[PDB]
Symmetry: C4
Subunit: 93 residues, 4 copies
């Protein structure tokens, strides 16, 4: 519960930072910058967007290292503290 809200907040802040950075420096629309930040930090990495500037590439290196741990922490406390009970909730007689 309180574990999940902190990681939720931390993740949001991380995604806000990426959104602001890539819309400014890489010139993406904010929605595209948010989408790209998520696709990056979850390691999906389609490559429909990718940084074209050296500033963007360097930030991306750091962003990935700092953000992956946080995002996946959230993903798997979300799966553990929120979806795992819910699935059990519609199971037991």
């Amino acid at each position: 519960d309180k574990e999940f809200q902190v990681l939720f907040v931390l993740t949001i802040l991380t995604l806000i930072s990426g959104t602001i950075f890539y819309s400014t420096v890489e010139g993406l629309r904010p929605i595209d910058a948010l989408y790209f930040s998520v696709v990056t930090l979850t390691t999906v990495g389609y490559g429909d967007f990718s940084p074209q500037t050296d500033f963007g590439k360097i930030f991306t290196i750091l962003y990935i290292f700092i953000g992956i741990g946080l995002v996946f922490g959230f993903i798997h406390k979300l799966a553990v503290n929120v979806q795992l009970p819910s699935i059990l909730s519609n199971l037991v007689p």
Copy 2:
């Protein structure tokens, strides 16, 4: 055993949702939509398909967060509860 069948079902439902969504909104053939959903949720993310609409991008953000935990849960109970014994089965004298 029963752990594996639930995750199997949960994963199928998730993949069905993606298939329906991306074939409708992004106009993919259903097979391509299924393939894309799998490539997305396993984080492989080739990028041969990727959402072109804002609706698609927003759904994809949410789809990734909800679905990755489930898919990898399945992958590694499949590896743990199904392939791990089977490999041992063809080992011991």
Copy 3:
């Protein structure tokens, strides 16, 4: 030790299957098929190669689900049973 050799073998067999499949059905050179199989199962997924046939897409879906667990098992017993001691070996006085 014996844990590591089994996973080594299992991984090789998986990579051989992908190499044969993608060189035949998707028409890749065998080296490209091997490279693509690795890039796929480690989830790197550059997308310089990706299946163009429905046969290829369906196989890829199954290949990913069966193979990711195995490949990462190997990766992290390799890191745990082989590189972890070696790094310690050049540490202690």
Copy 4:
């Protein structure tokens, strides 16, 4: 603490090796080679860069297998031994 500095060093060496290799054999600028090495070993894999030579493809196969375990080890001791306390530090009254 000392766990984190070793993994920091090991990761740097790995990234230096990739930078040197891909700038030489694949002809990338060193910054692009570093960026590509990171994007590769974190499995993000945009595909804006990817090896075009057989030498590059073979190295990449080996680089991925050796380096992923190390990089993610670092990522999650960084998240565990460095960011986890820091976040708690700005929490408690």
